[PDB]
Design a protein around this motif. Structure first.
Motif, PDB file in Angstrom:
ATOM      1  N   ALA C  31     -60.485 -65.894  -3.657  1.00 14.23           N
ATOM      2  CA  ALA C  31     -59.096 -66.343  -3.649  1.00 14.23           C
ATOM      3  C   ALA C  31     -58.684 -66.647  -2.216  1.00 14.23           C
ATOM      4  O   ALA C  31     -57.851 -67.517  -1.965  1.00 14.23           O
ATOM      5  CB  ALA C  31     -58.188 -65.264  -4.238  1.00 14.23           C
ATOM      6  N   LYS C  32     -59.285 -65.914  -1.283  1.00 16.57           N
ATOM      7  CA  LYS C  32     -59.024 -66.069   0.143  1.00 16.57           C
ATOM      8  C   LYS C  32     -60.354 -66.386   0.824  1.00 16.57           C
ATOM      9  O   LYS C  32     -61.346 -65.688   0.609  1.00 16.57           O
ATOM     10  CB  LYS C  32     -58.453 -64.765   0.715  1.00 16.57           C
ATOM     11  N   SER C  33     -60.378 -67.432   1.641  1.00 16.27           N
ATOM     12  CA  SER C  33     -61.607 -67.809   2.331  1.00 16.27           C
ATOM     13  C   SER C  33     -62.112 -66.682   3.229  1.00 16.27           C
ATOM     14  O   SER C  33     -61.341 -66.069   3.970  1.00 16.27           O
ATOM     15  CB  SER C  33     -61.379 -69.068   3.168  1.00 16.27           C
ATOM     16  N   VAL C  81     -78.617 -62.646   2.479  1.00 17.96           N
ATOM     17  CA  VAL C  81     -78.506 -64.098   2.499  1.00 17.96           C
ATOM     18  C   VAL C  81     -77.058 -64.405   2.858  1.00 17.96           C
ATOM     19  O   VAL C  81     -76.147 -64.024   2.129  1.00 17.96           O
ATOM     20  CB  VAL C  81     -78.803 -64.712   1.114  1.00 17.96           C
ATOM     21  N   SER C  82     -76.845 -65.078   3.986  1.00 16.82           N
ATOM     22  CA  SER C  82     -75.490 -65.414   4.411  1.00 16.82           C
ATOM     23  C   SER C  82     -75.082 -66.761   3.835  1.00 16.82           C
ATOM     24  O   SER C  82     -75.778 -67.760   4.015  1.00 16.82           O
ATOM     25  CB  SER C  82     -75.404 -65.459   5.941  1.00 16.82           C
ATOM     26  N   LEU C  83     -73.950 -66.785   3.141  1.00 14.21           N
ATOM     27  CA  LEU C  83     -73.458 -68.016   2.537  1.00 14.21           C
ATOM     28  C   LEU C  83     -72.427 -68.720   3.411  1.00 14.21           C
ATOM     29  O   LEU C  83     -72.076 -69.872   3.161  1.00 14.21           O
ATOM     30  CB  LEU C  83     -72.843 -67.719   1.164  1.00 14.21           C
ATOM     31  N   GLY C  84     -71.950 -68.030   4.443  1.00 12.51           N
ATOM     32  CA  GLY C  84     -70.949 -68.617   5.312  1.00 12.51           C
ATOM     33  C   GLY C  84     -69.572 -68.432   4.703  1.00 12.51           C
ATOM     34  O   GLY C  84     -69.333 -67.468   3.973  1.00 12.51           O
ATOM     35  N   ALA C  85     -68.667 -69.363   4.981  1.00 11.34           N
ATOM     36  CA  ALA C  85     -67.310 -69.279   4.459  1.00 11.34           C
ATOM     37  C   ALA C  85     -67.237 -69.635   2.980  1.00 11.34           C
ATOM     38  O   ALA C  85     -67.696 -70.700   2.556  1.00 11.34           O
ATOM     39  CB  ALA C  85     -66.386 -70.190   5.263  1.00 11.34           C
ATOM     40  N   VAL C  86     -66.664 -68.731   2.193  1.00  5.06           N
ATOM     41  CA  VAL C  86     -66.510 -68.962   0.763  1.00  5.06           C
ATOM     42  C   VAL C  86     -65.034 -68.863   0.396  1.00  5.06           C
ATOM     43  O   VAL C  86     -64.406 -67.815   0.572  1.00  5.06           O
ATOM     44  CB  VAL C  86     -67.305 -67.936  -0.073  1.00  5.06           C
ATOM     45  N   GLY C  87     -64.489 -69.966  -0.107  1.00  3.26           N
ATOM     46  CA  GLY C  87     -63.090 -70.001  -0.489  1.00  3.26           C
ATOM     47  C   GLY C  87     -62.904 -70.231  -1.975  1.00  3.26           C
ATOM     48  O   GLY C  87     -63.702 -69.764  -2.789  1.00  3.26           O
TER      49      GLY C  87
END
Lengths: 116, 205, 122
Positions: C31-33, C81-87
């Protein structure tokens, strides 16, 4: 038929049960009025839920039950789990698992409501 | 899938319990929810109780987990103590699949559970700014003189992005520092409400 | 705001008969990046700690296990495993299910493996 792999950690759950026997911290309501929050042991029993709460004569009395109006209640031990739904005609007990709320209902004929 | 209602739980000392929402967003699914607490070493620990520890959720609904303090007042009273809440969503499947080739995935959410003593010296909204740094040849040490765990992220040294860090109260943490990293440090933190705080300039000790 | 949520075609993946591979439709959104990552866990049979064991009871096939890959790279257990920014927009975990020999002789039968996927929040 539902299946749960035990290696992830069950027949009751595979049969629709929500919660296994155990002692749970629950909010106890009587006739839709809040009474308390404390541990209550739930044992296997005849119920659509598969488990039933264990409350003593003294616990029920302290919440409003008139023990003198319940036939055969005097024969129970102090620590016996009162068979509420059978011993008190049409009294009910249901645990809302999501809210961890034990909803108890007891007919007025058995409550301590005599004019005071 | 199944989602938690919070990304951390701050447990005020003295509280009888704290709650954590667990919501199943999958209407046609039934999950078995297994929850447990681990200490800072990642070992299952009973100083905090999560109940119900095992229950089934059929369809879309919200279930509330209660977290109970079972520390017997033994934890430090001048700083926060770290624990981890673990909530595993175990999927079910038809028994007819037992004669087929399958892979089942259980999703696990792991969040911080901070035991926070009452009457702490420093107010929580003043903690993040107190962070200090000590630079070494190929390492950067973060100094936390506050009674609160500091979750440091977006840590930069020059244009280099360093590893995130969880700095213990009245303690320190160290991260690797590329030899070419700049001397100008900036950082942000994740506060009590799980929000990323505005960038702050790193101050050396 | 609360935790993120994982969406899947099905968390119960019907695997192709061995030999064969299949992508695992599995994504996550918040819900929040926020920067997000995950790691796998379970019982492995290789020194590489990457081939998950067959738990089948009736008639399990021996010598083979389930190994996952992301962008072609084998993903060992407990390796973040890093996915980075998830919004708000769903981000794929990028996993593919494969079969990998555990070394022994291969026999006929089915495979029933289980894997845990853990998201640790900052």
């Amino acid at each position: 038929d539902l299946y749960f792999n035990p290696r992830f950690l069950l027949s009751r759950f595979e049969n629709g049960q929500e919660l296994p026997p155990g002692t749970y911290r629950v909010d106890i309501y009587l006739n839709n009025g809040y009474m308390a929050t404390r541990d209550v042991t739930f044992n296997t029993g005849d119920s659509e839920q598969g488990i039933v709460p264990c409350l003593t004569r003294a616990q029920l009395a302290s919440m409003g039950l008139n023990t003198a109006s319940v036939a055969g209640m005097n024969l129970l031990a102090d620590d016996a789990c009162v068979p509420l739904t059978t011993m008190v005609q049409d009294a009910t007990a249901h645990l809302d698992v999501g809210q961890q709320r034990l909803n108890l209902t007891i007919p007025q004929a058995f409550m301590s409501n005599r004019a005071r | 899938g199944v989602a938690l209602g919070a990304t951390r739980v701050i447990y005020p000392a003295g509280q009888k319990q704290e709650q954590l929402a667990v919501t199943n967003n999958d209407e046609n699914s039934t999950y078995l929810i297994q929850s447990w607490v681990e200490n800072a070493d990642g070992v299952k620990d009973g100083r905090f109780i999560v109940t119900p520890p095992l229950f089934a959720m059929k369809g879309k609904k919200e279930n509330t987990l209660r977290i109970l303090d079972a520390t017997n007042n033994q934890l430090p009273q001048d700083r926060e103590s770290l624990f981890w809440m673990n909530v595993k969503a175990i999927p079910s499947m038809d028994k007819s699949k037992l004669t087929e080739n399958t892979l089942q995935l259980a999703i696990i959410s792991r969040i911080k559970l901070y035991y926070r003593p009452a009457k702490l010296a420093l107010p929580p909204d003043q903690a993040a700014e107190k962070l200090r740094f000590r630079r070494s040849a190929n390492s950067l040490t973060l100094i936390n003189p506050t009674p609160y765990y500091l979750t440091v992220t977006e840590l930069n040294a020059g244009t280099r992005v360093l590893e995130n860090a969880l700095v213990p109260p009245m303690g320190e943490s160290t991260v690797k520092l590329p030899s070419d990293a700049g001397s100008n440090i900036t950082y942000r933190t994740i506060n009590d409400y799980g929000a990323l705080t505005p960038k702050m300039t790193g101050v050396m000790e | 705001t609360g935790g993120c949520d994982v969406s899947a075609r099905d968390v119960t993946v019907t695997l192709p008969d061995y030999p064969g591979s299949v992508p695992i439709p599995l994504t996550v959104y918040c819900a929040k990046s926020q920067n997000l990552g995950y790691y796998l866990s379970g019982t492995t049979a290789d020194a590489g700690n990457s081939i998950f064991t067959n738990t089948a009871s009736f008639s399990p096939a021996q010598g083979v296990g389930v190994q996952l890959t992301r962008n072609g790279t084998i993903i060992p257990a407990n390796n973040t495993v890093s996915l980075g920014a998830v919004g708000t927009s769903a981000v794929s975990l990028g996993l593919t299910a494969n079969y990998a020999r555990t070394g022994g002789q291969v026999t006929a039968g089915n495979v029933q493996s289980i894997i845990g996927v853990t998201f640790v929040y900052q």
